[PDB]
Write a protein that binds this DNA or RNA. Structure first.
Ligand SMILES: [Mg+2]
Ligand SMILES: [Mg+2]
Lengths: 685, 741, 538
RNA sequence: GGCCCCAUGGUGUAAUGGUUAGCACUCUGGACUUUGAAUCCAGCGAUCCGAGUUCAAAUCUCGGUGGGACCUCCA
């Protein structure tokens, strides 16, 4: 199983706005973000920190100047340069841009609550304040108008209808608090107002609603006695499962649910209730996922609830797969980018046991693949932690590549290490290989230290929940992390050295003993295992060599065979380093199935690869895996062998099933582990 | 005499299912011996009447072997076996059980037995040697050295088994020999040396289980028939003492089950020593192998076989004393016999044998005129038994002449409507009624001797005419009951029929009444809460009873009829709750005295209650119905009670009470007419281990010969004939002396 | 008649087949019939069965391989024998009142003498009715037919069919089991144990029995009763994976019971086959594809077998009134073939599909299926759309020799791992990688912590199936062209032992064998500890 | 002994040199772990036997084998 990783954050602060933000939307082709405030529209560019267009709705007798009025929502329109906006007063305005032309395109007596535009924008749906629903064509020519209203309500339900479209825009669902029963009720219609179905009576239904993009299950939330769960309706209107959030009863409120661009990652927004007189509240943005019908919890982000941190809205990128935009209250813009990966250990062949570490929130499900080849939902052993886990990494020492290092939300770098005596610490629990009679001879890690990270001075960190990303355990004492400075593209590399000399006392201190500055955004960092040389990829994809052992911390560009700089033609997500005969190469892969040895493309159909001790293994998109040696091969030899036109034979090629992804490599057994999209495992030679 | 006698007249039965249960002794007037259920039956084919029974086993009988007399006289001893882990030795004399020794020590049912009079010279009076092979993965060697038995030896064949055994003596001496085959596709020879049986040799023969071996001492040589299962007979030889292989004659295509040399016989003092061989197989054929006149190679002689339906072959066959007849035991249970035609030896003709149900006979009905009985059992078959005249000769014989139904369900009940009509309660929801064809009545005229014009009011068949050429046509079909029928009974006027079905609630436990002429439901009587186990109508034809599993009854009395054509109605006159009931457990039987005012009941609490008092019929204003006299405790679960249909001078009420174990007992009752209620019941006659069943008794139906309203022609008017519809496959008919006035 | 010359034809044709065999030259069969059929004056070509009939013994032995009719009955590895039981009522008509909606026939239906769900006209029905539901007669008839066709019946596999097999009393059930074992062996037993003990030493080996049941009669007691009988495979009707459907159709139970039955059966050691039922009268197409994706994705439903069944409407049933009144309109053939193609595309690489279409004749069905050849049309549409079907029923050696011509050249050991109803299982196989041809398989498991059998407690790994595919080679025979006696079972046992003692960390390896195969395991080093074969691995 | 006609899958007849053969009964195979005989879909199978005319003949000349028809000698 794989887990998400944070690699790029973009934060723009103090946007010069007249009032306060109320809604926002995106213009993906231009990359600019529109923000509808309580005064007028604002158009911003985050990568350059500028505000180009600024319309004043209040000036042209549209938004009342008294200090009120709500914009229902900013909606960008495709193949144009105008913006469709609404006002809570009950008007729809097709305000243009640049030319500053603002024409009234629709007026309704009762006010408008929510605007919903289909994923393709030709049919828009509006909800009135008189409890009626209007279906409008693209050009605002009226089409239809039908009424929504064809154990008790949850206390903090604000009686605000929400509408959701399917991915293909064939059906939609309306969420309404029925006046008769005083309970949340869901009705599903098709495109031309045919009443498809009505939801079944369920007590404790929440306000959220988000139809899955591909579309089989409608997300919602339900508060049951002693728990709060997320339930999945279906098109028929009946529940088809659920999963439980890890929280107490009557403590947290669910604001809204929203889906990914490919029905993969579900983000839930949680706010702490003010039940206690003080009850310092917390904000949670949680990124879960799905495996073998068991819902992992992969990420958890904590804002500040009240003050200059009020989270106003979230938007998944409709085009970019993994990108989330956050709009706060104090004119604040956040952007987060993620990508999948797996955490595995590489070391000396005589002692290394290939490992896989998988995050499930507050647990880590370790699997040792050298001895027990175990399916995903089960594990060899299990590590427990008090508060959710965010980043997990293994030691890079050649003879000790089995000592885990787990980071958590509250910044507590634990160091789990394997030793002679298991020490019987309760934090390590046996998985599927333990029990009465059942016993396999292996050694489990035992906790060693609970290092606590210290930062400069005593600042408030930032409204950003995460301050460190891409943690690398290059040596038992020395770590590595990278941060992005907000104003300049100057990225900073820290040195979380071990201030605590030895096992003096639990809760040791990790101190930032250095901070090097290198211009440009850093998207990935890696290190060699034998020479322990560090390679950075700037935003452009350029490869810079880094020298932590050097006192000057000098950063030099990576030189190719002819002593020339190396530049990837495209940004590279996954990077590893190989020892090809007598030269070291920055092997890399892109999101669009490209192999980029040094800087020359050598393939165009690769889905997943892995490099181990003189063994490069690849999974082509033609359902055919391949394995090349590196003991005596040369760059030209690899280029010719992987030229894809040289005749394929049975000594290298070996067919696989549809979508197999390599998990890890077992050299001494000459075995390979493949995972299919269904979820199971396969072993080949 | 003053105390009347009880005698058993007729017995019908057949071998059970098992291989090897058949034998003829080697001697004049030899007695056939086979095994039915849990007993051994001796029957003489020439007499065509069963000789006797030898009870004493408890489980199913498996294998039976005689012990021939060396001179050639009729045999005396009879070694047996069974599935109750015990081997019983028997000693017979004058067709009466003389002695029975219960040899025991087997941890598993026995399958093979063999014994022979040992011929030691130290005056060993009647010294025998029994061998028994069982399911205990072992074989035991015994000896009945006079009136004492002790186990000689035990040999265990590991986790294997033993399948065939025979004992004989080596030539020019009396050293015992033993041929023991097994499932190991192999036979072993054990010879007794010193004082213990030892291992001598191990033959490598066939490639299947051996289902039989047999020795034959001709002159000074030994020949071993070694029948197999892979369609291969193998004759060996043993000469002075090594064994040699010989002719491997074959020609069967299925499993071959039996092989037996034709035995020696004494014709006019000089003994004869034939060399032949008989065998049977699953292929539905018998092959009689004899050597050629000139060449010694063995060739087939005849191919006698049976062609009926699509049944399987045979498990066993027995040749004869000398050569006259041949018998084979079929699969489903049947005996086929053939004698050698004098004109052509290769020609063989069938004859007449006995038969019967191969599963427990559930119900029995006597003919209203009283010349045939219809029996129905779990064997999914109905059988009709009728007598025959053996021309100008005595000892008239009753045996099967028809087979009205070969229906495929499990039948459980029976009822007469008229001279030739038939109702059967199967394991379905439908009542099926039958009539008779003209062929049946024509053959009945031809057999019993009663005139055709008289029977219509103006040799017996063999297995071919019954299984294939006999089926009474079905005329109607009665629906209406939601569950399987459990109790059927009609009335004496042949007008109203009553039926009851299996039930678990009050609504389903309702009896249904039908009209004979127009077959539509006359009425539906609802009462009780469980299935009505027994029911019958009153002799005066105005009452009814429904004793059922709920330990209650019913007294549905007749209501007056105003319009003559209107169907009569019934009303509940009396009943009984848990408090009023005197029975402790389930009731299973009932019958009325033919006095119209008293009746009996029989439960599983070993009690026979004679509560009647259904008198003052014209002025029945209230209920005065309850216990009548003392409750008899016979000592077993009573299953069937019946009252003889004739009255007697001293107000005698004679009843034939059955039990669980066959213990048919005759009781005599009379009301004391006083508050002393003791000695009212008297005990007349019990049944011994020769006149009784070995399992449950289902119906003790008497004979009500309505044809003999007055005794026109009698041999003294002193006999009553009744039936015992048992559960051990037997339909024995008994005759009892009554009195002398 | 010239038919008398017809047996001279055989009398001549046989006279040819042996004659050339005497000089050892192969002779074509079709044209020899054609030639020695226009010379004796024939008007009909001979049928192979009559040719096989009249042959001398050794000549039968030498001409069976060249005169085998329908070479698929022994192309899977066993000899199927189908038997049924007495008609009986299903055990949920009491507290409900009516049996399942779509069930045709039965004891109280309008089909006279009809078993439940099997109306009157399937071939097993006429085979069984004439024997009046007697197991001895039925099994003997099937064996003699299989020998008539010219096959080897040395390895047999029973399948009991009909209604449910637990709603019957103990006497009737043990009667069936003992009669079957004795019919196959030849003994005449009194109880079940004697029958089993003689069947163990029998020559014609028995492999196991398959029973169908509802999940509400699948409990610990019933599993004990099965394990005494010698059964080794169970089938459960799992119609629909949606709870609303299983209540609107008067099914009488819930899906949770089905999942619990799956858990118990797979933990005990059986193999479970599901009966899914597309086009139920509330569902639709996309709902079908979603429910099948869930059924093959949820780690609480993954079986080791499957048997699809499109819906059929039959007179005198619950669906008949719905169809007549104007509800539950059927599917058009094209969309049905499309849908079936989608399921067969979703079928995982370890599930064997047995049957795709009901055997019901054309006149009986009022609507729902036109062509009784849906599997081949589905496969043609798979090759049309580019998608592929990759179960083991279309990758075992026997099937892909009669179909196609290729045969394995390079054999490799493939291994899969999974998550079943709560246990961890493996799947080892020897198969050709480059051509997708399967040879043999295995099924390990690690028993969960909800076992109820004493032998499997305390560190026990169970083996549920071993099967090497090819042609049925009789016991102790050795052939260098078939595959069933070349030695793959030993290697599978070696690797299973290594897995169970090094990875599983177990102490006992237990095998749910059949009865005739028992002796086989005695040559490996196993013992008997009840209805199991155990061995100490430490 | 001439005389006039005919020969096609195992069986029944189709088809006038672009040559280069379709239909019916029958047989075999797959759906099928519910079936040799049922359903559906695929398949194996022929222009008696020679010289030839025409670039080319199940299609035309001549043959000699088999069958049918008129007058047959014959015994
Ligand atoms: Mg023709
Ligand atoms: Mg066929």
């Amino acid at each position: 199983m794989r887990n998400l990783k944070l690699f790029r954050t973009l934060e723009f602060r103090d946007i010069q706005g007249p009032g306060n933000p109320q809604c926002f939307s995106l213009r993906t082709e231009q990359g600019t973000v529109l923000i509808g405030s309580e005064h007028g529209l604002i158009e911003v560019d985050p990568v350059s920190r500028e505000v180009k267009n600024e319309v004043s709705l209040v000036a042209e007798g549209f938004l009342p100047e008294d200090g009120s009025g709500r914009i229902v929502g900013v909606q960008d329109l495709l193949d144009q340069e105008s913006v469709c906006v609404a006002t809570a007063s009950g008007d729809v305005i097709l305000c243009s841009l640049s030319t500053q032309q603002l024409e009234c395109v629709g007026s309704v007596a009762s006010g408008i609550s929510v605007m919903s535009w289909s994923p393709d924008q030709e049919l828009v749906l509006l909800a009135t304040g008189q409890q009626t629903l209007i279906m409008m064509t693209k050009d605002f020519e009226p089409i239809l108008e039908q009424q929504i209203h064809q154990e008790s309500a949850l206390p903090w339900d604000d009686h605000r209808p929400q509408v959701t479209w399917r991915g293909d825009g064939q059906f939609f669902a309306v969420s309404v608090v029925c006046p008769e029963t005083g309970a949340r009720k869901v009705r599903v219609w098709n495109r031309e107002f045919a009443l498809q179905s009505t939801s079944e009576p369920v007590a404790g239904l929440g306000p959220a609603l988000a139809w899955k993009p591909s579309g089989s299950l409608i997300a919602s939330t339900q508060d049951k006695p002693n728990q709060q769960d997320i339930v999945f309706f279906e098109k028929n209107g009946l529940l088809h499962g659920h999963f439980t959030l890890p929280f107490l009863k009557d403590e947290v409120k669910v604001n809204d649910l929203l889906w990914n661009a490919d029905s993969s990652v579900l983000a839930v927004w949680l706010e702490d209730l003010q039940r206690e007189e003080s009850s310092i509240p917390k904000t949670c943005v949680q990124l879960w996922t799905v495996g073998n019908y068991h819902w992992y919890l992969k990420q958890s982000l904590s804002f500040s609830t009240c003050g200059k941190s009020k989270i106003v809205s979230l938007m998944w990128d409709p085009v970019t797969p993994y990108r989330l935009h956050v709009l706060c209250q104090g004119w604040h813009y956040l952007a987060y980018d993620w990508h999948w990966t797996t955490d595995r250990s590489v070391g000396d062949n005589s002692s290394d046991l290939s490992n896989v570490a998988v995050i499930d929130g507050n647990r880590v499900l370790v699997t040792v693949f050298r001895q027990t080849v175990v399916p995903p939902p089960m594990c060899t052993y299990q590590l427990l932690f008090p508060h959710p886990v965010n980043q997990v990494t293994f030691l890079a020492h050649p003879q000790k590549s089995n000592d885990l290092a787990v980071l958590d939300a509250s910044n507590q770098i634990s160091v789990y290490k394997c030793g002679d005596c298991p020490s019987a610490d309760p934090t390590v629990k046996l998985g599927a290989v333990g029990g009465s009679g059942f016993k396999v001879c292996l050694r489990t890690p035992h906790l060693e230290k609970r290092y606590k990270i210290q930062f400069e001075n005593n600042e408030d960190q930032d409204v950003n929940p995460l301050k460190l990303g891409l943690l690398t355990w290059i040596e038992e004492d020395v770590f590595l992390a990278v941060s992005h400075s907000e104003f300049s593209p100057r990225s900073v590399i820290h040195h979380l050295t071990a201030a605590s000399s030895e096992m003096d006392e639990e809760h040791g201190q990790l101190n930032v003993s250095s901070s090097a500055a290198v211009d440009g955004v850093i998207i990935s960092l890696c290190c060699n295992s034998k020479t322990k040389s560090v390679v950075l990829q700037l935003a452009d994809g350029q490869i810079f060599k880094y020298l932590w052992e050097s006192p000057s911390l000098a950063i030099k560009p990576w030189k190719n065979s002819g002593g020339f700089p190396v530049r990837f033609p495209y940004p590279c997500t996954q990077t590893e380093l190989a020892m090809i005969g007598e030269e070291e190469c920055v092997l890399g892969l892109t999101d669009r199935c490209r192999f980029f040895i040094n800087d020359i493309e050598v393939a165009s159909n690769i889905t997943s690869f892995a490099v181990y001790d003189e063994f490069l293994l690849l999974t082509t998109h033609s359902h055919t895996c391949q394995c090349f040696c590196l003991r005596d091969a040369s760059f030209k030899t690899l280029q010719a062998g992987l030229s894809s036109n040289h005749v394929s034979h049975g000594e290298v090629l070996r067919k696989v099933e549809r979508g197999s992804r390599i998990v890890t490599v077992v050299p001494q057994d000459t075995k390979l582990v493949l995972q299919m999209p269904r979820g199971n495992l396969e072993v080949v030679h | 005499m003053v105390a009347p006698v009880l005698e058993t007249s007729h017995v019908f039965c057949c071998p059970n299912r098992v291989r090897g249960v058949l034998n003829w002794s080697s001697g004049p007037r030899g007695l056939l011996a086979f095994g039915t259920s849990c007993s051994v039956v001796l029957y003489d084919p020439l007499k065509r009447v069963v000789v006797t029974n030898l009870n004493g086993h408890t489980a199913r009988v498996n294998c039976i072997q005689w012990i021939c007399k060396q001179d050639g006289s009729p045999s005396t001893e009879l070694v047996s076996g069974g599935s109750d882990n015990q081997v019983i030795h028997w000693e017979i004399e004058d067709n009466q059980l003389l002695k029975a020794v219960h040899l025991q020590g087997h941890e598993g049912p026995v399958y093979a037995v063999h014994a022979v009079y040992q011929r030691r010279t130290s005056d060993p009076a009647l010294c025998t040697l029994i061998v028994s092979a069982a399911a205990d993965s072992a074989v035991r060697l015994w000896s009945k050295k006079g009136p004492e038995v002790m186990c000689l030896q035990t040999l265990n064949f590991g986790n294997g088994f033993a399948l065939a055994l025979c004992l004989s003596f080596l030539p020019n001496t009396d050293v015992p020999i033993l041929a023991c085959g097994n499932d190991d596709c192999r036979i072993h020879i054990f010879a007794q040396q010193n004082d213990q049986f030892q291992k001598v040799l191990s033959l490598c023969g066939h490639e299947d289980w051996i289902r039989g071996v047999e020795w034959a001492a001709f002159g000074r040589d030994l020949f071993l028939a070694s029948c197999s299962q892979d369609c291969l007979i193998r004759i060996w030889k043993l000469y002075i003492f090594a064994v040699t292989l010989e002719t491997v004659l074959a020609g069967h295509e299925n499993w071959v089950n039996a092989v037996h040399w034709q035995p020696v016989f004494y014709k006019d003092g000089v003994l004869q020593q034939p060399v032949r061989l008989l065998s049977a197989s699953m292929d539905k054929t018998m092959i009689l192998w004899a050597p050629d006149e000139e060449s010694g190679v063995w060739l087939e002689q005849v191919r006698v076989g049976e062609v009926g339906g699509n049944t399987l072959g045979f498990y066993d066959c027995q040749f004869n004393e000398d050569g006259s007849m041949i018998i084979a035991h079929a699969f489903h249970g049947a005996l086929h016999l053939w004698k050698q035609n004098t004109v052509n030896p290769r020609e063989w003709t069938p004859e007449i044998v006995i038969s019967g149900h191969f599963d427990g006979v559930q119900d029995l009905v006597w003919d209203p005129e009283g010349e045939f009985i219809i029996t129905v059992g779990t064997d999914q078959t109905t059988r009709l038994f009728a007598p025959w005249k053996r021309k100008d000769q005595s000892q008239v014989t009753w045996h099967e002449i028809a087979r009205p139904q070969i229906h495929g369900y499990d039948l459980k009940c029976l009822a007469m409507i008229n001279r030739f009509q038939f109702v059967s309660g199967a394991d379905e929801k439908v009542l099926r009624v039958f009539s008779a064809p003209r062929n049946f009545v024509e053959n009945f005229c031809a057999i019993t001797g009663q005139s055709l014009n008289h029977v219509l009011c103006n040799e017996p068949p063999t297995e071919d005419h019954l299984l294939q050429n006999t089926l009474w046509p079905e005329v109607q079909k009665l629906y209406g009951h939601g569950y399987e029928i459990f109790c059927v009974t009609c009335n004496s006027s042949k007008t109203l029929l009553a039926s009851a079905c299996k039930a678990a609630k009050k609504e389903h436990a309702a009896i249904i009444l039908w009209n004979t002429t127009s077959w539509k439901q006359v009425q539906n009587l609802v009462f009780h809460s469980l299935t009505v186990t027994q029911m019958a109508f009153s002799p005066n034809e105005k009452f009814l009873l429904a004793v059922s599993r709920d330990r209650t009854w019913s007294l549905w009395k007749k209501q007056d009829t105003i319009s003559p054509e209107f169907e009569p109605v019934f009303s509940l006159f009396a009943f009984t709750n848990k408090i009023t009931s005197v029975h402790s457990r389930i009731i299973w039987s009932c019958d009325w005295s033919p006095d119209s005012k008293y009746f009996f009941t029989g439960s599983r609490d070993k009690k026979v209650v004679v509560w009647g008092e259904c008198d003052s019929t014209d002025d029945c204003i209230e209920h005065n119905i309850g216990p009548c006299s003392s409750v008899l405790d016979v000592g077993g679960a009573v299953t069937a009670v019946s009252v003889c249909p004739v009255l007697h001078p001293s107000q005698r009420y004679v009843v034939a009470v059955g039990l669980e174990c066959g213990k048919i007992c005759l009781y005599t009752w009379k009301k004391t007419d006083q508050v002393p209620e003791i000695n009212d019941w008297t005990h007349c006659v019990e049944t011994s281990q020769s006149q009784s069943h070995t399992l449950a008794i289902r119906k003790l139906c008497w004979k009500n010969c309505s044809g003999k309203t007055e005794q026109k022609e009698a041999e003294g008017a002193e006999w009553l004939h009744f039936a015992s519809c048992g559960e051990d496959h037997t339909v024995k008919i008994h005759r009892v002396n009554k009195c002398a006035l | 008649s010239p038919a008398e010359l017809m047996m001279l034809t055989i009398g001549d044709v046989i006279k040819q087949l042996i004659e050339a065999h005497e000089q050892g030259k192969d002779i074509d069969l079709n044209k020899v019939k054609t030639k020695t059929a226009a010379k004796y004056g024939l008007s009909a070509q001979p049928r192979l069965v009559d040719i096989i009939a009249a042959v001398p013994p050794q000549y039968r032995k030498v001409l069976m391989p060249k005169l085998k009719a329908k070479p698929i009955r022994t192309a899977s590895g066993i000899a199927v024998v189908a038997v049924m039981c007495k008609p009986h009522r299903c055990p949920h008509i009491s507290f409900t009142g009516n049996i399942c909606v779509y069930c045709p026939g039965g004891p109280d239906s309008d089909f006279e003498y009809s078993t439940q769900s099997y109306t009157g006209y399937e071939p097993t029905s006429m085979r069984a009715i004439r024997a009046r539901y007697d197991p001895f007669l039925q099994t003997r008839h099937r064996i003699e037919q299989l020998k008539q066709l010219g096959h080897s019946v040395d390895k047999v596999e029973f399948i009991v069919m009909g209604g449910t097999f637990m709603a019957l009393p103990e006497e009737y059930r043990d009667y069936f089991i003992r009669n079957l074992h004795d019919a196959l062996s030849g003994h005449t037993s009194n109880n079940i144990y004697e029958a089993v003990k003689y069947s163990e030493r029998s020559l014609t080996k028995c492999i196991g029995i398959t029973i169908e049941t509802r999940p509400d009669y699948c409990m610990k007691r019933h599993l004990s009763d099965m394990l005494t009988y010698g059964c080794t495979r169970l089938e459960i009707g799992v119609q629909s994976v949606y709870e609303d459907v299983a209540r609107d159709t008067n099914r009488g139970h819930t899906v949770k019971a089905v999942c619990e039955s799956f858990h118990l059966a797979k933990d005990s050691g059986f193999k479970v086959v599901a009966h899914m039922m597309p086009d139920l009268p509330n569902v639709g197409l996309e709902r079908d594809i979603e429910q099948f994706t869930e059924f093959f994705e949820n780690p609480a439903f993954r079986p080791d077998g499957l048997k699809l069944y499109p819906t059929l409407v039959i007179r005198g049933t619950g669906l008949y009134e719905l169809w007549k009144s104007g509800r539950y309109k059927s599917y058009s053939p094209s969309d049905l073939v499309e849908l079936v193609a989608r399921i067969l595309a979703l079928v995982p690489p370890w599930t064997r599909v047995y049957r795709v279409q009901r055997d019901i004749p054309m006149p009986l069905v009022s609507s729902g299926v036109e062509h009784g050849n849906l599997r081949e049309l589905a496969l043609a549409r798979m090759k049309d759309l580019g998608i592929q079907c990759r179960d083991v029923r279309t990758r075992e050696v026997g099937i892909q020799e009669i179909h196609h011509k290729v045969r394995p050249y390079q054999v490799e050991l493939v291994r899969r791992d999974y998550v079943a109803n709560g246990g961890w299982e493996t799947f080892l196989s020897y198969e050709d990688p480059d051509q997708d041809i399967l040879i043999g398989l295995l099924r390990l498991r690690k028993c969960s912590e909800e076992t109820f059998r004493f032998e499997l407690g305390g560190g026990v790994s169970i083996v549920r199936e071993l099967h090497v595919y090819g042609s049925v080679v009789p016991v102790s025979s050795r052939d260098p062209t078939k595959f069933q006696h070349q030695g793959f079972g030993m290697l599978l046992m070696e690797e299973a032992e290594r897995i169970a003692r090094e990875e599983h960390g177990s102490g006992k390896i237990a095998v749910i064998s059949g009865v005739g195969t028992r002796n086989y395991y005695r040559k490996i080093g196993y013992r008997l500890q009840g209805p199991y074969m155990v061995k100490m691995l430490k």
